[PDB]
Amino acid sequence: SEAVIKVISSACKTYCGKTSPSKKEIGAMLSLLQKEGLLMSPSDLYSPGSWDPITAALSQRAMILGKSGELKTWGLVLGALKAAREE
């Protein structure tokens, strides 16, 4: 799951624009989406269609639990992959 972090760690710097996530966060997110039962692999981040239930899910967890670390990474990592498919 190294190629799934390089494609985002390099793309976010072009999409997010001085607002990319943290290297330690990316690894703490791609692994969460799996256990959460959202995706089966980190490369699934390139699947524009399941972000709906995934985005609303992480947004609800931050509230129920109270934290917002993982969700923060999703909101950013998604801000890039979203503009990717476009252009």
Short mmCIF file of all heavy atoms in Angstrom, two decimals, residues 8-76:
data_model
loop_
_atom_site.label_atom_id
_atom_site.label_comp_id
_atom_site.label_asym_id
_atom_site.label_seq_id
_atom_site.Cartn_x
_atom_site.Cartn_y
_atom_site.Cartn_z
N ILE A 8 -1.33 9.95 -3.83
CA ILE A 8 -2.11 10.95 -3.11
C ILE A 8 -1.22 12.02 -2.49
O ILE A 8 -1.54 13.20 -2.51
CB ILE A 8 -2.97 10.31 -2.00
CG1 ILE A 8 -3.92 9.27 -2.60
CG2 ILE A 8 -3.74 11.37 -1.24
CD1 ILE A 8 -4.61 8.42 -1.56
N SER A 9 -0.08 11.58 -1.95
CA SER A 9 0.86 12.50 -1.32
C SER A 9 1.48 13.44 -2.36
O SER A 9 2.07 14.46 -2.01
CB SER A 9 1.97 11.72 -0.61
OG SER A 9 3.07 12.56 -0.30
N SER A 10 1.33 13.09 -3.63
CA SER A 10 1.87 13.90 -4.72
C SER A 10 0.75 14.65 -5.44
O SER A 10 0.96 15.74 -5.96
CB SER A 10 2.63 13.01 -5.71
OG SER A 10 3.23 13.79 -6.73
N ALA A 11 -0.43 14.04 -5.48
CA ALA A 11 -1.58 14.65 -6.14
C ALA A 11 -2.21 15.73 -5.27
O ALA A 11 -2.55 16.81 -5.75
CB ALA A 11 -2.61 13.59 -6.49
N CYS A 12 -2.35 15.44 -3.98
CA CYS A 12 -2.94 16.38 -3.04
C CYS A 12 -2.18 17.71 -3.05
O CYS A 12 -2.76 18.77 -2.84
CB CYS A 12 -2.94 15.79 -1.63
SG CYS A 12 -4.36 14.73 -1.27
N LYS A 13 -0.87 17.63 -3.30
CA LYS A 13 -0.03 18.82 -3.34
C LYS A 13 -0.36 19.68 -4.56
O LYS A 13 0.09 20.82 -4.67
CB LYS A 13 1.45 18.43 -3.36
CG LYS A 13 1.81 17.39 -2.31
CD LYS A 13 1.66 17.94 -0.91
CE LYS A 13 2.72 18.99 -0.60
NZ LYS A 13 3.05 19.03 0.85
N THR A 14 -1.14 19.12 -5.47
CA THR A 14 -1.53 19.83 -6.69
C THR A 14 -3.01 20.19 -6.66
O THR A 14 -3.44 21.15 -7.30
CB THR A 14 -1.23 19.00 -7.95
OG1 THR A 14 0.18 18.83 -8.11
CG2 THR A 14 -1.82 19.66 -9.18
N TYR A 15 -3.79 19.41 -5.92
CA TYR A 15 -5.23 19.64 -5.82
C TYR A 15 -5.56 20.46 -4.57
O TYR A 15 -6.15 21.53 -4.65
CB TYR A 15 -5.98 18.31 -5.79
CG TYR A 15 -5.88 17.54 -7.08
CD1 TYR A 15 -5.14 16.37 -7.16
CD2 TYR A 15 -6.54 17.97 -8.23
CE1 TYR A 15 -5.04 15.65 -8.34
CE2 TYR A 15 -6.46 17.26 -9.41
CZ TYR A 15 -5.71 16.10 -9.46
OH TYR A 15 -5.62 15.39 -10.64
N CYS A 16 -5.17 19.93 -3.41
CA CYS A 16 -5.42 20.61 -2.15
C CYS A 16 -4.74 21.97 -2.11
O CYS A 16 -5.31 22.95 -1.62
CB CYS A 16 -4.93 19.75 -0.98
SG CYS A 16 -5.62 18.08 -0.95
N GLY A 17 -3.52 22.03 -2.63
CA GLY A 17 -2.78 23.28 -2.65
C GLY A 17 -2.38 23.74 -1.26
O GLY A 17 -3.12 24.48 -0.61
N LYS A 18 -1.22 23.30 -0.81
CA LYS A 18 -0.72 23.66 0.51
C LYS A 18 -1.74 23.33 1.59
O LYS A 18 -1.97 24.11 2.52
CB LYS A 18 -0.38 25.15 0.56
CG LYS A 18 0.45 25.55 1.77
CD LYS A 18 -0.01 26.88 2.35
CE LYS A 18 0.78 28.04 1.77
NZ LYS A 18 0.44 29.33 2.44
N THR A 19 -2.37 22.16 1.47
CA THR A 19 -3.37 21.72 2.44
C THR A 19 -3.50 20.20 2.45
O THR A 19 -4.52 19.66 2.87
CB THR A 19 -4.75 22.34 2.13
OG1 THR A 19 -4.70 23.07 0.90
CG2 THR A 19 -5.18 23.27 3.26
N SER A 20 -2.45 19.52 1.98
CA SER A 20 -2.45 18.07 1.93
C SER A 20 -2.41 17.48 3.34
O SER A 20 -2.00 18.13 4.30
CB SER A 20 -1.26 17.56 1.12
OG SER A 20 -0.11 18.36 1.34
N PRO A 21 -2.83 16.21 3.46
CA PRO A 21 -2.85 15.50 4.75
C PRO A 21 -1.45 15.18 5.25
O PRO A 21 -0.46 15.66 4.70
CB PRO A 21 -3.61 14.21 4.43
CG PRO A 21 -3.41 14.00 2.97
CD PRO A 21 -3.33 15.37 2.36
N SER A 22 -1.37 14.38 6.31
CA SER A 22 -0.09 14.00 6.89
C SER A 22 0.27 12.57 6.52
O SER A 22 -0.59 11.69 6.47
CB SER A 22 -0.14 14.15 8.41
OG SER A 22 0.93 14.96 8.88
N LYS A 23 1.55 12.34 6.25
CA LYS A 23 2.04 11.02 5.88
C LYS A 23 1.58 9.97 6.89
O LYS A 23 1.18 8.87 6.52
CB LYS A 23 3.56 11.02 5.78
CG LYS A 23 4.14 9.69 5.31
CD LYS A 23 5.66 9.70 5.36
CE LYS A 23 6.22 8.29 5.38
NZ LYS A 23 7.57 8.21 4.75
N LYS A 24 1.64 10.32 8.17
CA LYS A 24 1.24 9.42 9.24
C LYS A 24 -0.28 9.25 9.25
O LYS A 24 -0.79 8.21 9.68
CB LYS A 24 1.71 9.94 10.59
CG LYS A 24 1.25 9.10 11.77
CD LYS A 24 1.71 7.66 11.64
CE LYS A 24 1.71 6.95 12.98
NZ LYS A 24 0.78 5.78 13.00
N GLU A 25 -0.99 10.26 8.78
CA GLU A 25 -2.45 10.22 8.74
C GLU A 25 -2.94 9.32 7.62
O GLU A 25 -3.83 8.49 7.82
CB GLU A 25 -3.02 11.63 8.56
CG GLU A 25 -3.17 12.40 9.86
CD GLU A 25 -4.39 13.30 9.87
OE1 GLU A 25 -4.40 14.29 9.11
OE2 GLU A 25 -5.34 13.01 10.62
N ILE A 26 -2.35 9.48 6.44
CA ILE A 26 -2.73 8.68 5.28
C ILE A 26 -2.70 7.19 5.61
O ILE A 26 -3.57 6.43 5.20
CB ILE A 26 -1.80 8.94 4.08
CG1 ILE A 26 -1.85 10.42 3.69
CG2 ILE A 26 -2.18 8.06 2.91
CD1 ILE A 26 -0.82 10.81 2.65
N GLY A 27 -1.68 6.77 6.36
CA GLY A 27 -1.55 5.38 6.74
C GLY A 27 -2.52 4.98 7.84
O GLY A 27 -2.83 3.81 8.01
N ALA A 28 -3.00 5.97 8.58
CA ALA A 28 -3.94 5.72 9.67
C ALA A 28 -5.38 5.86 9.19
O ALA A 28 -6.32 5.69 9.97
CB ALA A 28 -3.68 6.68 10.82
N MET A 29 -5.55 6.16 7.91
CA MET A 29 -6.88 6.32 7.32
C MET A 29 -7.20 5.16 6.39
O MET A 29 -8.25 4.52 6.51
CB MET A 29 -6.98 7.64 6.57
CG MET A 29 -8.31 7.85 5.87
SD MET A 29 -8.29 9.25 4.73
CE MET A 29 -7.55 8.49 3.29
N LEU A 30 -6.30 4.90 5.45
CA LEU A 30 -6.49 3.81 4.49
C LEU A 30 -6.72 2.49 5.20
O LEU A 30 -7.38 1.59 4.67
CB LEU A 30 -5.27 3.70 3.57
CG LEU A 30 -5.31 4.55 2.30
CD1 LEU A 30 -6.51 4.17 1.45
CD2 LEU A 30 -5.33 6.03 2.64
N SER A 31 -6.18 2.37 6.41
CA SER A 31 -6.33 1.15 7.20
C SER A 31 -7.66 1.15 7.95
O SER A 31 -8.20 0.09 8.28
CB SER A 31 -5.17 1.00 8.18
OG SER A 31 -5.53 0.17 9.27
N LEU A 32 -8.17 2.34 8.23
CA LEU A 32 -9.43 2.48 8.94
C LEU A 32 -10.61 2.13 8.04
O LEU A 32 -11.50 1.37 8.43
CB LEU A 32 -9.59 3.91 9.47
CG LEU A 32 -10.89 4.22 10.22
CD1 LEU A 32 -11.19 3.13 11.23
CD2 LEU A 32 -10.81 5.58 10.89
N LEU A 33 -10.62 2.70 6.84
CA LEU A 33 -11.69 2.44 5.88
C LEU A 33 -11.91 0.95 5.69
O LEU A 33 -13.02 0.50 5.41
CB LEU A 33 -11.37 3.10 4.54
CG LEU A 33 -11.05 4.59 4.58
CD1 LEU A 33 -10.27 5.01 3.34
CD2 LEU A 33 -12.32 5.41 4.71
N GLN A 34 -10.84 0.17 5.85
CA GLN A 34 -10.91 -1.28 5.70
C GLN A 34 -11.66 -1.91 6.87
O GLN A 34 -12.67 -2.58 6.69
CB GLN A 34 -9.51 -1.87 5.59
CG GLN A 34 -8.72 -1.37 4.39
CD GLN A 34 -7.31 -1.91 4.35
OE1 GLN A 34 -6.48 -1.57 5.19
NE2 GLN A 34 -7.03 -2.76 3.37
N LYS A 35 -11.15 -1.69 8.08
CA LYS A 35 -11.76 -2.24 9.28
C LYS A 35 -13.20 -1.74 9.43
O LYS A 35 -14.08 -2.47 9.89
CB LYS A 35 -10.95 -1.86 10.52
CG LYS A 35 -10.61 -0.38 10.59
CD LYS A 35 -9.97 -0.01 11.92
CE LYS A 35 -11.02 0.22 13.00
NZ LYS A 35 -11.11 -0.93 13.94
N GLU A 36 -13.43 -0.49 9.05
CA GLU A 36 -14.76 0.11 9.15
C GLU A 36 -15.75 -0.64 8.25
O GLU A 36 -16.96 -0.50 8.41
CB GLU A 36 -14.71 1.59 8.75
CG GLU A 36 -14.89 2.53 9.92
CD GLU A 36 -15.75 3.74 9.57
OE1 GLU A 36 -16.84 3.54 9.00
OE2 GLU A 36 -15.32 4.87 9.87
N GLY A 37 -15.22 -1.42 7.32
CA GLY A 37 -16.08 -2.17 6.41
C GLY A 37 -16.49 -1.36 5.20
O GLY A 37 -17.51 -1.65 4.57
N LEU A 38 -15.71 -0.34 4.87
CA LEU A 38 -16.00 0.52 3.73
C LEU A 38 -15.38 -0.05 2.46
O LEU A 38 -16.08 -0.30 1.47
CB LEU A 38 -15.48 1.93 3.98
CG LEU A 38 -16.13 2.69 5.14
CD1 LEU A 38 -15.51 4.07 5.28
CD2 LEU A 38 -17.63 2.80 4.93
N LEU A 39 -14.07 -0.24 2.48
CA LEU A 39 -13.35 -0.78 1.33
C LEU A 39 -12.56 -2.03 1.71
O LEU A 39 -12.41 -2.34 2.89
CB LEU A 39 -12.41 0.28 0.75
CG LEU A 39 -11.68 1.16 1.76
CD1 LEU A 39 -10.58 0.37 2.46
CD2 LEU A 39 -11.11 2.39 1.08
N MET A 40 -12.06 -2.73 0.70
CA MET A 40 -11.28 -3.94 0.93
C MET A 40 -9.79 -3.66 0.81
O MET A 40 -8.96 -4.37 1.38
CB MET A 40 -11.68 -5.04 -0.06
CG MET A 40 -12.30 -6.26 0.60
SD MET A 40 -14.06 -6.43 0.25
CE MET A 40 -14.76 -5.51 1.61
N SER A 41 -9.44 -2.61 0.07
CA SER A 41 -8.05 -2.24 -0.13
C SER A 41 -7.90 -0.72 -0.20
O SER A 41 -8.86 0.01 -0.43
CB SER A 41 -7.50 -2.87 -1.41
OG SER A 41 -6.55 -3.88 -1.12
N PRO A 42 -6.67 -0.24 0.02
CA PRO A 42 -6.36 1.19 -0.01
C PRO A 42 -6.45 1.78 -1.42
O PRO A 42 -6.66 2.98 -1.59
CB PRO A 42 -4.92 1.26 0.51
CG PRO A 42 -4.34 -0.08 0.19
CD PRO A 42 -5.48 -1.06 0.31
N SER A 43 -6.28 0.92 -2.42
CA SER A 43 -6.34 1.35 -3.81
C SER A 43 -7.78 1.64 -4.23
O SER A 43 -8.02 2.16 -5.32
CB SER A 43 -5.74 0.28 -4.72
OG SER A 43 -5.87 -1.01 -4.15
N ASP A 44 -8.72 1.31 -3.35
CA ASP A 44 -10.13 1.54 -3.63
C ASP A 44 -10.47 3.03 -3.55
O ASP A 44 -11.57 3.45 -3.91
CB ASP A 44 -11.00 0.76 -2.64
CG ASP A 44 -12.16 0.06 -3.32
OD1 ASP A 44 -13.03 0.77 -3.88
OD2 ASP A 44 -12.21 -1.18 -3.29
N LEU A 45 -9.51 3.82 -3.09
CA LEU A 45 -9.70 5.27 -2.97
C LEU A 45 -9.93 5.90 -4.34
O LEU A 45 -10.40 7.04 -4.43
CB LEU A 45 -8.48 5.91 -2.30
CG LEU A 45 -8.76 6.72 -1.04
CD1 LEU A 45 -9.27 5.83 0.08
CD2 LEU A 45 -7.51 7.47 -0.60
N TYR A 46 -9.61 5.16 -5.39
CA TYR A 46 -9.78 5.66 -6.75
C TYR A 46 -11.14 5.23 -7.32
O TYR A 46 -11.32 5.16 -8.53
CB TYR A 46 -8.66 5.14 -7.65
CG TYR A 46 -7.28 5.36 -7.08
CD1 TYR A 46 -6.34 4.34 -7.07
CD2 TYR A 46 -6.91 6.59 -6.54
CE1 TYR A 46 -5.08 4.53 -6.54
CE2 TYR A 46 -5.65 6.79 -6.01
CZ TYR A 46 -4.74 5.76 -6.02
OH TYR A 46 -3.48 5.95 -5.49
N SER A 47 -12.08 4.94 -6.42
CA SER A 47 -13.41 4.51 -6.83
C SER A 47 -14.45 5.57 -6.48
O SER A 47 -15.07 5.55 -5.42
CB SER A 47 -13.77 3.19 -6.16
OG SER A 47 -14.80 2.51 -6.87
N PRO A 48 -14.64 6.53 -7.40
CA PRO A 48 -15.61 7.62 -7.22
C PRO A 48 -17.05 7.13 -7.28
O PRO A 48 -17.66 7.09 -8.34
CB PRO A 48 -15.31 8.56 -8.39
CG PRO A 48 -14.71 7.68 -9.44
CD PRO A 48 -13.94 6.62 -8.69
N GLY A 49 -17.59 6.76 -6.12
CA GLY A 49 -18.96 6.29 -6.06
C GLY A 49 -19.35 5.82 -4.67
O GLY A 49 -20.52 5.90 -4.29
N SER A 50 -18.38 5.33 -3.92
CA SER A 50 -18.63 4.84 -2.56
C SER A 50 -18.22 5.89 -1.53
O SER A 50 -18.28 5.63 -0.32
CB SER A 50 -17.87 3.54 -2.32
OG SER A 50 -18.64 2.42 -2.70
N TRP A 51 -17.80 7.05 -2.00
CA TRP A 51 -17.38 8.13 -1.12
C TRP A 51 -18.58 8.74 -0.40
O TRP A 51 -18.43 9.37 0.65
CB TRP A 51 -16.64 9.21 -1.91
CG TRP A 51 -15.45 8.69 -2.66
CD1 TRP A 51 -14.73 7.57 -2.37
CD2 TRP A 51 -14.84 9.28 -3.81
NE1 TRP A 51 -13.71 7.42 -3.28
CE2 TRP A 51 -13.75 8.45 -4.17
CE3 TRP A 51 -15.10 10.41 -4.58
CZ2 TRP A 51 -12.94 8.73 -5.26
CZ3 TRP A 51 -14.29 10.69 -5.66
CH2 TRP A 51 -13.22 9.85 -6.00
N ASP A 52 -19.76 8.55 -0.97
CA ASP A 52 -20.99 9.08 -0.38
C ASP A 52 -21.20 8.53 1.03
O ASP A 52 -21.25 9.26 2.01
CB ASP A 52 -22.19 8.75 -1.26
CG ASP A 52 -22.64 9.93 -2.10
OD1 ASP A 52 -21.78 10.54 -2.77
OD2 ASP A 52 -23.85 10.25 -2.08
N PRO A 53 -21.33 7.20 1.12
CA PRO A 53 -21.54 6.51 2.40
C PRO A 53 -20.31 6.55 3.29
O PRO A 53 -20.41 6.48 4.52
CB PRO A 53 -21.86 5.07 1.98
CG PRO A 53 -21.20 4.91 0.65
CD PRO A 53 -21.28 6.26 -0.01
N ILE A 54 -19.14 6.66 2.67
CA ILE A 54 -17.88 6.71 3.41
C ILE A 54 -17.67 8.08 4.04
O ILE A 54 -17.20 8.19 5.17
CB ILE A 54 -16.68 6.40 2.49
CG1 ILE A 54 -16.73 4.94 2.03
CG2 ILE A 54 -15.37 6.68 3.22
CD1 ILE A 54 -15.77 4.63 0.91
N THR A 55 -18.03 9.13 3.31
CA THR A 55 -17.89 10.49 3.81
C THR A 55 -18.87 10.78 4.94
O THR A 55 -18.50 11.36 5.96
CB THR A 55 -18.11 11.53 2.68
OG1 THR A 55 -17.11 11.36 1.67
CG2 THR A 55 -18.05 12.94 3.23
N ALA A 56 -20.12 10.36 4.75
CA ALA A 56 -21.15 10.56 5.76
C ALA A 56 -20.91 9.69 6.98
O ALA A 56 -21.33 10.02 8.09
CB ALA A 56 -22.53 10.28 5.17
N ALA A 57 -20.23 8.56 6.77
CA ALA A 57 -19.93 7.64 7.86
C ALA A 57 -18.85 8.21 8.78
O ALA A 57 -19.00 8.20 10.00
CB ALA A 57 -19.49 6.29 7.30
N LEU A 58 -17.77 8.70 8.19
CA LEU A 58 -16.66 9.27 8.95
C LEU A 58 -17.09 10.55 9.65
O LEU A 58 -16.60 10.88 10.73
CB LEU A 58 -15.47 9.54 8.04
CG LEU A 58 -14.81 8.31 7.41
CD1 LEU A 58 -13.94 8.72 6.23
CD2 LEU A 58 -13.99 7.55 8.44
N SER A 59 -18.01 11.28 9.02
CA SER A 59 -18.51 12.53 9.58
C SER A 59 -19.37 12.28 10.81
O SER A 59 -19.46 13.12 11.70
CB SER A 59 -19.32 13.30 8.53
OG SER A 59 -20.01 14.38 9.12
N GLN A 60 -19.99 11.11 10.86
CA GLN A 60 -20.84 10.74 11.98
C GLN A 60 -20.02 10.18 13.13
O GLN A 60 -20.34 10.38 14.30
CB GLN A 60 -21.89 9.72 11.54
CG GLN A 60 -22.66 9.09 12.70
CD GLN A 60 -24.16 9.15 12.50
OE1 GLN A 60 -24.77 8.19 12.02
NE2 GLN A 60 -24.77 10.27 12.87
N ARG A 61 -18.95 9.47 12.79
CA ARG A 61 -18.07 8.87 13.80
C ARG A 61 -17.40 9.95 14.64
O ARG A 61 -17.36 9.86 15.87
CB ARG A 61 -17.01 8.00 13.13
CG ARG A 61 -16.40 6.96 14.05
CD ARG A 61 -15.24 6.23 13.39
NE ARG A 61 -14.57 5.32 14.31
CZ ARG A 61 -15.09 4.17 14.72
NH1 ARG A 61 -16.29 3.79 14.29
NH2 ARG A 61 -14.42 3.39 15.56
N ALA A 62 -16.87 10.97 13.97
CA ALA A 62 -16.20 12.07 14.66
C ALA A 62 -17.09 12.66 15.75
O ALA A 62 -16.60 13.15 16.76
CB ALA A 62 -15.79 13.15 13.66
N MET A 63 -18.40 12.61 15.52
CA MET A 63 -19.35 13.14 16.49
C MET A 63 -19.63 12.13 17.60
O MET A 63 -19.45 12.43 18.78
CB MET A 63 -20.66 13.52 15.78
CG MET A 63 -20.48 14.52 14.66
SD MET A 63 -21.99 15.44 14.30
CE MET A 63 -23.17 14.11 14.12
N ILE A 64 -20.06 10.94 17.21
CA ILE A 64 -20.35 9.88 18.17
C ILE A 64 -19.18 9.65 19.11
O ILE A 64 -19.35 9.60 20.33
CB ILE A 64 -20.70 8.56 17.46
CG1 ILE A 64 -21.90 8.75 16.53
CG2 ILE A 64 -20.99 7.47 18.49
CD1 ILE A 64 -22.07 7.63 15.53
N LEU A 65 -17.99 9.52 18.54
CA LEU A 65 -16.78 9.29 19.33
C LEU A 65 -16.29 10.60 19.95
O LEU A 65 -15.88 10.62 21.11
CB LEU A 65 -15.68 8.69 18.46
CG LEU A 65 -15.47 7.18 18.60
CD1 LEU A 65 -14.81 6.62 17.35
CD2 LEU A 65 -14.63 6.88 19.83
N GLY A 66 -16.34 11.68 19.18
CA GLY A 66 -15.90 12.97 19.67
C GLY A 66 -14.64 13.45 18.99
O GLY A 66 -14.36 14.65 18.95
N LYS A 67 -13.86 12.51 18.45
CA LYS A 67 -12.62 12.85 17.76
C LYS A 67 -12.90 13.33 16.34
O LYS A 67 -14.05 13.53 15.96
CB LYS A 67 -11.69 11.64 17.72
CG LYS A 67 -12.11 10.58 16.72
CD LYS A 67 -11.91 9.17 17.27
CE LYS A 67 -10.44 8.87 17.48
NZ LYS A 67 -10.18 7.40 17.53
N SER A 68 -11.84 13.52 15.56
CA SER A 68 -11.97 13.98 14.19
C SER A 68 -10.62 13.94 13.47
O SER A 68 -10.35 14.75 12.59
CB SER A 68 -12.52 15.41 14.16
OG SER A 68 -11.96 16.20 15.18
N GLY A 69 -9.78 12.98 13.86
CA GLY A 69 -8.48 12.84 13.24
C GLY A 69 -8.54 12.13 11.90
O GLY A 69 -8.06 12.65 10.90
N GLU A 70 -9.13 10.94 11.89
CA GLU A 70 -9.24 10.16 10.67
C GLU A 70 -10.08 10.89 9.63
O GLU A 70 -9.67 11.05 8.48
CB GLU A 70 -9.87 8.79 10.97
CG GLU A 70 -9.22 8.06 12.13
CD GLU A 70 -10.20 7.77 13.26
OE1 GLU A 70 -11.39 7.53 12.96
OE2 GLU A 70 -9.77 7.77 14.43
N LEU A 71 -11.26 11.35 10.04
CA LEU A 71 -12.15 12.07 9.14
C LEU A 71 -11.43 13.24 8.47
O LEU A 71 -11.62 13.50 7.28
CB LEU A 71 -13.37 12.60 9.92
CG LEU A 71 -14.27 13.58 9.17
CD1 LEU A 71 -14.96 12.89 8.00
CD2 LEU A 71 -15.29 14.19 10.11
N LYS A 72 -10.59 13.93 9.24
CA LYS A 72 -9.83 15.06 8.71
C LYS A 72 -9.01 14.65 7.50
O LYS A 72 -8.88 15.41 6.54
CB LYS A 72 -8.91 15.63 9.80
CG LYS A 72 -9.46 16.88 10.47
CD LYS A 72 -9.42 18.07 9.53
CE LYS A 72 -8.22 18.97 9.82
NZ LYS A 72 -8.55 20.03 10.81
N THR A 73 -8.46 13.44 7.54
CA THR A 73 -7.65 12.93 6.44
C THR A 73 -8.51 12.61 5.23
O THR A 73 -8.10 12.84 4.09
CB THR A 73 -6.88 11.66 6.86
OG1 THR A 73 -6.27 11.85 8.13
CG2 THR A 73 -5.82 11.31 5.82
N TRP A 74 -9.71 12.09 5.47
CA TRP A 74 -10.63 11.74 4.39
C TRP A 74 -11.10 13.00 3.66
O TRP A 74 -11.15 13.02 2.43
CB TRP A 74 -11.83 10.98 4.95
CG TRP A 74 -12.83 10.61 3.90
CD1 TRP A 74 -14.15 10.97 3.87
CD2 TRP A 74 -12.60 9.82 2.73
NE1 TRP A 74 -14.76 10.44 2.75
CE2 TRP A 74 -13.83 9.74 2.03
CE3 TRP A 74 -11.48 9.18 2.19
CZ2 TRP A 74 -13.96 9.04 0.84
CZ3 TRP A 74 -11.61 8.49 1.01
CH2 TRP A 74 -12.84 8.42 0.34
N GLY A 75 -11.44 14.03 4.43
CA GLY A 75 -11.91 15.27 3.83
C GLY A 75 -10.87 15.90 2.92
O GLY A 75 -11.22 16.60 1.97
N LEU A 76 -9.60 15.64 3.21
CA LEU A 76 -8.51 16.19 2.41
C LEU A 76 -8.15 15.25 1.26
O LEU A 76 -8.12 15.65 0.10
CB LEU A 76 -7.28 16.44 3.28
CG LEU A 76 -7.25 17.77 4.03
CD1 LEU A 76 -6.01 17.87 4.90
CD2 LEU A 76 -7.32 18.94 3.06
#
